[PDB]
Each structure stands twice: as C-alpha cells, then as structure tokens.
C-alpha cells in the first residue's frame, strides 16, 4: 500500500494501458476509432452501436 | 448545574472540537485551539491534572469537576444504540473544546465565574 511501490510501474502503453470499457478485459481490444472494446462485447452489441452486417 | 458544558460538547462535536485525551488536549491547548478545558480531579495518578493545570496557566481557563468515567459517559464516547451508555465502558481523562460552535447560552457565564473571577 506504500505510495512509491504500489502501482508504481508506468502504464503508458501495452495491454494493461487500455481496457474494455465494458468488462475491462485486457484481451483483444478494438482501439480503432476509440472503441477500446473487446471483440466479444463488440459482437454482442454491434447492431446497437450501429455496426451492421452488409457484405 | 453544568448543563451548558454538554451544549458546548455537542456543538464542538458538530465542528470537531473535542481534543479528547491528554496529548490531543495538550496539542489543542499549546496551539491557539484550546478554548474550554475539563480535567478530572478524581485521578489515581494525581499528576496528569497538575501538568494540565500548569499548561493551562501557560487558553487559561479550567473547569475540572471530578468523576472521569461519568465524563466519558456524557462527553459522547461510544456508539448510540440507546441514547445513554450504549458503549460498554469508556473513560475520558481530559476533554478540551477547540471550536466554540453554535450555542453560547450559558458558556460565557460559567468560565468567567470559575477561573476568570
């Protein structure tokens, strides 16, 4: 819980820098256009964001 | 009698004024914080009250009374399961009020009567 050791490592880039904003999962994120959502929840809600299957 | 000391206790509980204990009361008294001090005469050691009085004279006034455990009871120590003595036991050696708070119905009377003469 000490300030200088807990969470001390920088997190500018890498897997743990950006989270799912849905479940927070580190795995398979759509950073493109600022979605930052994993492919799972994207598949779940794509019709709701506006992503539709067209071709 | 002494029905205004509980009032100042409550109003400085509202504004975080009770520097309860000995070191808290001491740090309130040495700084420009100690306003009304209560040191219990009925102490077995019979030394801490002398030290508190000496520091108070140096924030001068004192209202000592007696019966420390009762002071712990009606100072507001513990948890209010019932409004009275819901805490198992507790004892407050010295209670110093730091902020005057809201109500001063009889507070100025009692201090000037006891120590200010």
């Amino acid at each position: 819980a000490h300030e200088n050791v807990w969470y001390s490592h920088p997190r500018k880039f890498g897997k743990g820098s950006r989270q799912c904003r849905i479940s927070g999962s580190h795995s398979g994120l759509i950073r493109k256009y600022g979605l930052n959502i994993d492919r799972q929840s994207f598949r779940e809600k794509a019709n709701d964001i506006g992503f539709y299957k067209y071709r | 009698i002494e029905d205004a000391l509980k009032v100042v206790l409550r109003t400085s509980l509202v504004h975080d004024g009770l520097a309860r204990g000995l070191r808290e009361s001491a740090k309130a008294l040495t700084r420009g914080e100690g306003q009304l001090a209560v040191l219990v005469e009925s102490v077995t050691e019979e030394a801490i009250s002398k030290l508190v009085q000496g520091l108070a004279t140096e924030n001068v006034p004192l209202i000592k009374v007696a019966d420390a455990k009762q002071l712990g009871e009606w100072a507001g120590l513990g948890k209010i399961d019932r409004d009275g003595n819901a805490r198992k036991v507790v004892g407050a050696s010295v209670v110093v009020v730091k902020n005057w708070g809201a109500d001063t119905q009889e507070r100025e009377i009692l201090l000037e009567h006891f120590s200010q003469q």
Binding site: - | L22, A26, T30, R31, L51, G54
Partner: protein
C-alpha cells in the same frame, strides 16, 4: 485443469509490527515546576508551531509534523 499443492514456506514467519504502546507518554513531554511554570522536554518544532515536541533518538530531532523534512542533527 490446474491442481496446486499446499504452499510450503522457506521462511519461519513475519508478523505485523504491533506498534509500541507507551504508558503515559504525555507526562514525559511536560514537567510542572511546583504548581506553576511548565517546562518542555526534548525539543520543539519552529515550523509546525509551538507544542510539537521533537524526538531525541540518535542525535536527530525527529518531529511528528515534518517527519520527512525535519530530522535536525544536534
């Protein structure tokens, strides 16, 4: 499948430091001189304001407010 064995420590034990309680450490801070003038022991901090006594320890006044900033050799 994951089946971990019971943990084995190559270390006897390290328990939380129970902080050293002092019986009436307040009295060591002050000394009344025959129902009158009161004297402070150790030292005092000019930064925080009068009242905060400075620890003696090993030739380095260790205040309570400026724990990091004030360890003054004397």
């Amino acid at each position: 499948g994951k089946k971990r064995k019971k943990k084995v420590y190559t270390t006897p034990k390290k328990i939380r430091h129970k902080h050293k309680k002092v019986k009436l450490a307040v009295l060591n801070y002050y000394k009344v001189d025959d129902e009158g003038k009161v004297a402070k022991l150790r030292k005092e901090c000019p930064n925080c304001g009068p009242g905060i006594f400075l620890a003696n320890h090993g030739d380095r006044f260790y205040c309570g407010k400026c724990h990091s900033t004030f360890a003054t050799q004397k």
